[PDB]
Amino acid sequence: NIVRKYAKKLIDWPPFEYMILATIIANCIVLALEQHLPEDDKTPMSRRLEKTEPYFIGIFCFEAGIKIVALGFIFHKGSYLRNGWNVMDFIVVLSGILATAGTHFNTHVDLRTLRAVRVLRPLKLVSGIPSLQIVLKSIMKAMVPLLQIGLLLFFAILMFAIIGLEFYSGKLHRACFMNNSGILEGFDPPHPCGVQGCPAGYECKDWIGPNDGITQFDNILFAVLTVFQCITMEGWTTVLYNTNDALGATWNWLYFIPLIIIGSFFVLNLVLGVLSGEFAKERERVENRRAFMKLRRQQQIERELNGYRAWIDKAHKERLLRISIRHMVKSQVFYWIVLSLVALNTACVAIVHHNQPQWLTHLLYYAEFLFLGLFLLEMSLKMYGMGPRLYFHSSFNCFDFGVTVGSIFEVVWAIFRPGTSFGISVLRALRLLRIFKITKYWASLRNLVVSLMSSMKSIISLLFLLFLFIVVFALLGMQLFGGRFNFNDGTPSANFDTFPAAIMTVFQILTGEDWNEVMYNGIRSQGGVSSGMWSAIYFIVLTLFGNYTLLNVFLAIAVDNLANAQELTKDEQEEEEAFNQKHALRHHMSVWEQRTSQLRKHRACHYIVNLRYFEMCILLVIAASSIALAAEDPVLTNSERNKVLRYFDYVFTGVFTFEMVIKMIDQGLWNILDFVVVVGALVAFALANALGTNKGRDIKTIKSLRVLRVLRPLKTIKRLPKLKAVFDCVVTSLKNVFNILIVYKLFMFIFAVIAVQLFKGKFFYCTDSSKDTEKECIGNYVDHEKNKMEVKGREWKRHEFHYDNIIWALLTLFTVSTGEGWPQVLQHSVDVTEEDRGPSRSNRMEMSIFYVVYFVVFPFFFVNIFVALIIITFQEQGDKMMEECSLEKNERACIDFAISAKPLTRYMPQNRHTFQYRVWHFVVSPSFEYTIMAMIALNTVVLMMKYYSAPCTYELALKYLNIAFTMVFSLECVLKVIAFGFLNYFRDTWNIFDFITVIGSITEIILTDSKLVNTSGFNMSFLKLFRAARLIKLLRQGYTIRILLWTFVQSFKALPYVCLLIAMLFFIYAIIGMQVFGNIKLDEESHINRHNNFRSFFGSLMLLFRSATGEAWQEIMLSCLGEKGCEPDTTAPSGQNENERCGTDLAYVYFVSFIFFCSFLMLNLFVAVIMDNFEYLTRDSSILGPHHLDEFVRVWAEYDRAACGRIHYTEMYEMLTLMSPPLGLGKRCPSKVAYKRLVLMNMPVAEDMTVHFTSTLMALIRTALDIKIAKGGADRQQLDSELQKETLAIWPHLSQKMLDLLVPMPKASDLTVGKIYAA
Ligand SMILES: CC(C)CCC[C@@H](C)[C@H]1CC[C@H]2[C@@H]3CC=C4C[C@@H](OC(=O)CCC(=O)O)CC[C@]4(C)[C@H]3CC[C@]12C
Ligand SMILES: CC(C)CCC[C@@H](C)[C@H]1CC[C@H]2[C@@H]3CC=C4C[C@@H](OC(=O)CCC(=O)O)CC[C@]4(C)[C@H]3CC[C@]12C
Ligand SMILES: CC(C)CCC[C@@H](C)[C@H]1CC[C@H]2[C@@H]3CC=C4C[C@@H](OC(=O)CCC(=O)O)CC[C@]4(C)[C@H]3CC[C@]12C
Ligand SMILES: CC(C)CCC[C@@H](C)[C@H]1CC[C@H]2[C@@H]3CC=C4C[C@@H](OC(=O)CCC(=O)O)CC[C@]4(C)[C@H]3CC[C@]12C
Ligand SMILES: CC(C)CCC[C@@H](C)[C@H]1CC[C@H]2[C@@H]3CC=C4C[C@@H](OC(=O)CCC(=O)O)CC[C@]4(C)[C@H]3CC[C@]12C
Ligand SMILES: CC(C)CCC[C@@H](C)[C@H]1CC[C@H]2[C@@H]3CC=C4C[C@@H](OC(=O)CCC(=O)O)CC[C@]4(C)[C@H]3CC[C@]12C
Ligand SMILES: CC(C)CCC[C@@H](C)[C@H]1CC[C@H]2[C@@H]3CC=C4C[C@@H](OC(=O)CCC(=O)O)CC[C@]4(C)[C@H]3CC[C@]12C
Ligand SMILES: CC(C)CCC[C@@H](C)[C@H]1CC[C@H]2[C@@H]3CC=C4C[C@@H](OC(=O)CCC(=O)O)CC[C@]4(C)[C@H]3CC[C@]12C
Ligand SMILES: CC(C)CCC[C@@H](C)[C@H]1CC[C@H]2[C@@H]3CC=C4C[C@@H](OC(=O)CCC(=O)O)CC[C@]4(C)[C@H]3CC[C@]12C
Ligand SMILES: CC1(C)O[C@@H]2[C@@H](CO[C@@]3(COS(N)(=O)=O)OC(C)(C)O[C@@H]23)O1
Ligand SMILES: CCCCCCCCCCCCCCCC
Ligand SMILES: CCCCCCCCCCCCCCCC
Ligand SMILES: CCCCCCCCCCCCCCCC
Ligand SMILES: [Ca+2]
């Protein structure tokens, strides 16, 4: 079976690989055409197609046959299966052979599980095109570092699930149903019970869980799914509200806020940091520097070539008029005429709206033709007037020709199909980007476009892989859930029946927004909270490996193509401003640039205002005034508190004016903020004290000039010199991303204009689904669908987020960008028919293309462009210390913790008595520590084995297992105190943690039993935490999770003001919200509920956090708008029927801005952390950081136990000849290579020919990193003098005892431990 003379290996060749490539495309089309019907039903077309599967199976088994006979199978090394892709090729064809062997046995096996392998057939495209595999491998290569955030993530999910199991395990099963015996009612958002009982006339009956039983903490598997849902931030507030109802709203915020902060924000920070480190380390590989230099050289060629092409300045009608054309048609007044007339074109097509006055329709009708013809003329004048042959040589010239032909297309197609007019003539607004040519920002952007246009075969071949995996997951979802979504309510819009509706729900699940509800449908599809929950695993493996592989793809693209355009533009100013300006006669280098370059290298009276207690005693008043803002009651206008705080308002404005006046005295004429606040306070006080009446509706005047008070916290920014510095960092980041913010705004405007042309006037609907016009939608109608059959009135409405004016298009596209509620906008956009006609379900299903090209551009591409610009260009915060430690920088400087790490164990009993070497022995030499890690790994299981409604003995089984594990752990505790000593035990920061946990568990076991009455107004539940903290003991045996956590928490401790700006943002907006929307009448039908309201400071803080985490903020914005009801206020006799205006239309500004500020101020806090640890995140095995450097302590303590000496020299080559080679020799290099390393290390001697600890430490450090070392002689000592000067320059706190130790001064006369075996 090794028969040579194959003759089939020559058939694996040019043509029979381009036929397999076509059979696969045909097969993918066939799998696309299929439609899945609910119960054994089949469309005629699907029966038609089911008669092609044998053809494809035949061709694929033929491929297996020819490849197998022309190669080996397994035993041959280069055989068939030894390829990685051929094994899955073979599995797919195997299942093709098997699944078509059903009729023979009538499928008595009842597989229902083998044609689901067919969905892997699209991946055979990757197998057939290696140009796609070598992109896929690169992508999968960038995600290997992530498999420690995942373990960090799954730990957090587990740690918060255990806790959930303790606290909400069975407490979500009673709901408040209307008494109404027989027909129980309940709410539409069901209201749970607890000791918090039913409100008015409802009774507390049984209930399956919240989402038909799916969103509860019953098992551990139900808790690690609810908590995974909350971490993805989808519907985490519904869970928070359920547990608030079911238990009481006082402690639940402690579980769900740190679950979102730790699990959802901190994990984004880790993932961004890890990926950015990986991108810095991957841009410098040789095969990537090579392909970048190939781009920089070609940019040099073109840059000089255009300058040379400027030297072509040559000075009957073939030359008589065609000389003046090309003159004028390139003059600087012509560019400006064209660019000031395209700016009229894009203002003409941006004023179209719905119901535009009938004169505008005709005026703009003439305008399209006028401008189109004018651009035809001033395009031909470039083509017939300068030459078609050399016409396509400018990029935007090709682009303008394309837009002109497209506009001609649009005119014709509007003529022959009136209606849809998607109007590609706003694309000419792209020419406005040419305006940048007149600024200094042209290079930064032309280089970006050059770096994008070069790397386009690798962006397309990468979007194509995203598309293949979406197709595979769409077909898999069709298999699992195809036609099973026909519920008795009606099939949802997020189907899996047909292909265009499976693609657009896999797209939701990737963009991860409302994957919640799709998963609930896909669970009740296959059963319920029952046999059906095994399919919560398609929506987890697609909302994880999608929310993360799509930020590693779109961040790789945007960091690569933007670090390229930053290094391309650093080599213009480094030539045109540093080469010619010299030969024709650091320096603000960001953190990323530094790191990647390092990798590639491998009146008189008042002036006594100043009292040391004036600029610090006004700060206290600012703080007290800010806090007093928080305690206003928004609703009870004339309560006790509001009067007390009004007197405080007098006090505070008095202080602020008495200091503003003296400041203006000493300063004459950030302070404008002080001025505005004091002027507003004075004006409000004056015109409220004076009359208050006799001016039209001027209660709101004082109410609105008291919103200016919220600026009082802002006054601190100038006072605190470091808060001011962080604020300025935020502003300079905003200025960095401002040439791209404008390109973003321009592209978003173009999409908004297109969306207005496409959906204007079409977002209307009658409240009665049968009528579909404003003429018909009048009267009353019986509503059966509420299942109450009640007579309502027909109203003709718009949808709330429509696209009938460019302002409304911009707002409802911003809503799509933030992600919230875009599935509903897509649902409205497909169900669209004609102007002023009502919807028709899943009509015009192609308007979903607009909503994927949108996502590929704005939420995926530009947002990652912004993250990458802020990462790449981030300046070190404080660097004004002699050019940033000119000679010893991050890795050099920080590796000098040799001033530390002197100590060693010092824990051995050193008594050799009994217990001294008995217990402290037993403890060491694992036969005890392994057995105790086993008890940790089993106590982690008895915490996962809680569940609700257990049999009985299982419950006691758990109690006694807990007792046994607590007994073993308390034996841990008092078996190391007496083995390590009382003082030594409480000093390792993990022993005290274990002690706290064992004490907590012991007291829990005591308290839950008798001999202490469980009264005196105190609750014992929190002690369960001490039992669930034992799972943290699994983290101790980490050291790769622990290093990340320590590294990223340290850099949170070094930015105490970056997360004070976010607290101040939240404070300012919470106070504004309380003032403005504080007295909206709560309505459970709206989103100003009893849960979600601005009624209190902490309620508004929760509302703002809910919105920041992107949780239906759009509907809070809509339910805060004008004309809403109002609270009774129970303190006034007037304004009962009136002041039915207690909303406001500033909600749009209030929520569109916060979402832009909180999403920006968080980005900074992310980058400010990432760039803090950029040395850890770009650490490498080649390049030393402290990561390798602590191994030296281990090898020292074990192999030497020197204690400042006690080495002589044997320990040296007893050290270096074994341990890993970032420090030098290593095991495989005990040769003359080691000899020539040692001859570079030279350092003095001691009593027994010995040396010091840290002297050797610097010896290894400098001999590896090359930190100021010569080849010998007094040369190395003068270099050492330089090094000593540098060390004193960094650290003055080193005494000459320790300093001389670090600069051991090996004079030439004094022989070394290095020049002993050398000579
Ligand atoms: C220079 C370019 C890029 C921007 C120019 C701005 C316009 C595109 C914006 C500015 C304000 C907008 C207007 C703001 C308010 C309205 C009223 C509103 O129409 C109605 O009141 C409906 C009933 C009616 O037409 O009488 C929506 C269209 C319109 C004119 C908007 C159309 C688009 C306008 C003119
Ligand atoms: C949380 C505190 C310690 C932060 C620092 C600010 C405090 C020094 C002061 C500044 C203004 C003070 C407030 C000014 C006025 C009032 C009204 C005063 O009267 C009532 O509300 C009594 C109502 C009742 O009897 O129930 C109660 C304290 C309170 C809220 C004060 C609480 C303490 C505040 C916030
Ligand atoms: C400004 C930069 C980002 C250029 C990229 C934008 C355009 C290339 C995109 C924006 C939205 C897209 C459009 C949005 C949705 C549709 C509707 C879809 O259905 C139709 O309108 C045609 C059939 C019909 O409805 O009669 C056809 C593709 C089209 C025009 C899309 C084609 C590509 C468009 C114009
Ligand atoms: C019985 C199990 C299935 C219940 C749940 C606990 C597990 C997650 C246990 C099973 C065995 C345990 C492991 C047994 C031995 C080791 C080796 C050791 O791993 C190290 O990182 C060692 C130090 C190093 O080499 O850096 C200590 C942790 C670990 C992985 C243990 C971690 C916890 C594990 C994986
Ligand atoms: C890595 C390994 C060790 C996973 C850990 C296994 C156990 C710690 C977990 C995983 C599966 C869990 C089980 C999944 C489902 C069920 C069925 C369910 O029991 C019922 O019949 C409940 C009925 C009801 O609640 O009305 C809840 C307990 C139990 C056995 C769970 C108990 C805890 C189990 C065994
Ligand atoms: C070593 C630690 C970390 C885990 C040990 C797990 C198993 C060895 C044991 C411990 C408790 C046992 C459970 C204790 C009680 C019950 C209830 C029992 O059902 C009854 O109602 C009991 C009827 C009877 O026997 O009288 C069925 C077995 C079961 C689930 C046992 C199954 C086996 C379990 C899980
Ligand atoms: C019971 C199942 C369902 C989950 C149990 C909890 C896991 C999330 C925990 C238990 C043990 C933990 C592991 C214990 C030890 C290690 C080895 C450790 O690896 C290293 O640090 C590499 C060695 C080195 O470089 O020092 C860190 C990850 C890991 C797998 C830990 C990851 C998190 C684990 C798997
Ligand atoms: C559920 C998760 C998110 C919380 C777990 C707590 C961690 C944030 C903290 C708690 C205790 C910390 C540990 C406490 C002490 C040390 C020793 C310390 O060691 C070093 O400085 C480096 C090694 C050396 O040079 O000796 C810093 C890492 C480590 C393991 C810390 C790592 C980060 C830990 C695990
Ligand atoms: C990244 C972090 C460390 C920066 C600083 C914190 C901020 C992100 C802010 C914004 C959201 C704030 C939280 C928003 C919501 C709440 C609930 C709020 O709840 C209550 O006081 C009562 C219960 C209820 O909310 O109904 C208490 C403040 C708190 C935790 C806030 C604490 C401070 C937070 C986390
Ligand atoms: C680490 C980093 C930034 O991401 C990798 C890898 C090599 O370059 C990538 C970047 O994507 S692209 N098409 O803009 O070149 O291109 C591919 C080949 C897709 O892989 C990309 O660089
Ligand atoms: C040796 C190079 C190839 C590495 C092994 C094959 C990888 C590709 C096959 C598996 C792809 C994922 C299949 C599961 C569904 C997404
Ligand atoms: C030679 C062209 C000069 C262009 C100057 C402005 C460029 C602005 C950045 C363009 C980014 C395009 C991204 C489009 C969406 C994928
Ligand atoms: C990623 C690109 C594909 C996007 C798929 C969704 C749009 C599908 C457009 C064609 C819709 C045809 C509907 C036929 C009847 C269901
Ligand atoms: Ca959401």
Coordinates of N, CA and C and ligand atoms in Angstrom, one line a residue, residues 343-344 346-358 360 429 432 746 749 753 798 804-808, ligand 1:
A343 N -19.5 71.8 -1.7 CA -20.1 72.1 -0.4 C -21.5 72.7 -0.5
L344 N -21.9 73.3 -1.6 CA -23.3 73.6 -1.8 C -24.1 72.4 -2.2
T346 N -23.7 69.3 -1.2 CA -23.9 68.6 0.0 C -24.6 69.3 1.1
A347 N -25.0 70.6 0.9 CA -26.0 71.3 1.7 C -27.3 71.3 1.0
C348 N -27.4 71.2 -0.3 CA -28.7 71.0 -0.9 C -29.2 69.6 -0.6
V349 N -28.4 68.5 -0.8 CA -28.9 67.2 -0.3 C -28.4 67.0 1.1
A350 N -28.9 67.8 2.0 CA -29.0 67.5 3.4 C -30.1 68.2 4.1
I351 N -30.9 69.0 3.3 CA -32.1 69.7 3.8 C -33.3 69.0 3.5
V352 N -33.2 67.9 2.6 CA -34.4 67.1 2.4 C -34.9 66.5 3.7
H353 N -36.2 66.5 3.9 CA -36.8 65.9 5.1 C -38.1 65.3 4.6
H354 N -38.9 64.9 5.6 CA -40.2 64.4 5.3 C -41.2 65.6 5.3
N355 N -42.0 65.7 4.3 CA -43.0 66.8 4.2 C -42.2 68.1 3.9
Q356 N -41.2 68.1 3.2 CA -40.5 69.3 2.8 C -41.4 70.1 1.9
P357 N -41.5 71.4 2.1 CA -42.4 72.2 1.3 C -42.3 72.0 -0.2
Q358 N -43.4 72.0 -0.9 CA -43.5 71.6 -2.3 C -42.6 72.4 -3.2
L360 N -39.5 73.2 -2.3 CA -38.2 72.6 -2.2 C -38.1 71.4 -3.0
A429 N -19.2 64.7 -0.9 CA -18.7 65.3 0.3 C -17.4 64.8 0.7
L432 N -14.4 67.0 0.4 CA -14.1 68.0 1.4 C -12.9 67.6 2.2
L746 N -17.7 63.4 9.1 CA -18.1 63.4 7.7 C -18.7 62.1 7.2
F749 N -22.1 61.7 8.6 CA -23.0 62.6 7.8 C -23.4 62.0 6.5
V753 N -27.3 61.1 5.5 CA -28.0 61.6 4.3 C -28.5 60.4 3.5
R798 N -45.2 57.7 14.5 CA -43.8 57.4 14.1 C -43.2 56.4 15.0
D804 N -36.1 60.9 9.4 CA -36.9 61.7 8.5 C -36.3 63.1 8.4
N805 N -35.1 63.4 8.8 CA -34.5 64.7 8.8 C -33.0 64.4 9.1
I806 N -32.0 65.1 8.6 CA -30.7 64.6 8.9 C -30.4 64.7 10.4
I807 N -31.1 65.5 11.2 CA -30.8 65.4 12.6 C -31.3 64.1 13.2
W808 N -32.5 63.7 12.8 CA -33.0 62.4 13.3 C -32.2 61.3 12.8
Ligands
LIG1 C1 -23.6 72.5 5.7 C2 -24.3 71.2 5.8 C3 -23.3 70.0 6.0 C4 -25.3 71.2 7.0 C5 -26.4 72.2 6.9 C6 -27.5 72.0 8.0 C7 -28.8 71.4 7.5 C8 -28.5 70.1 6.8 C9 -29.7 71.2 8.7 C10 -29.6 72.3 9.7 C11 -30.9 72.3 10.6 C12 -31.8 71.3 9.9 C13 -33.3 71.5 9.9 C14 -33.8 71.5 11.4 C15 -35.3 71.5 11.4 C16 -36.1 71.1 10.4 C17 -37.6 71.1 10.5 C18 -38.2 69.8 10.3 O1 -39.3 69.8 9.4 C19 -40.5 70.2 9.8 O2 -40.7 71.0 10.6 C20 -41.5 69.3 9.2 C21 -42.7 70.0 8.6 C22 -42.4 71.0 7.5 O3 -41.6 70.6 6.6 O4 -42.9 72.1 7.5 C23 -37.1 68.8 9.7 C24 -36.3 69.5 8.6 C25 -35.5 70.7 9.1 C26 -35.8 71.9 8.1 C27 -34.0 70.4 9.2 C28 -33.4 70.0 7.8 C29 -31.9 69.9 7.8 C30 -31.3 71.2 8.4 C31 -31.6 72.4 7.6

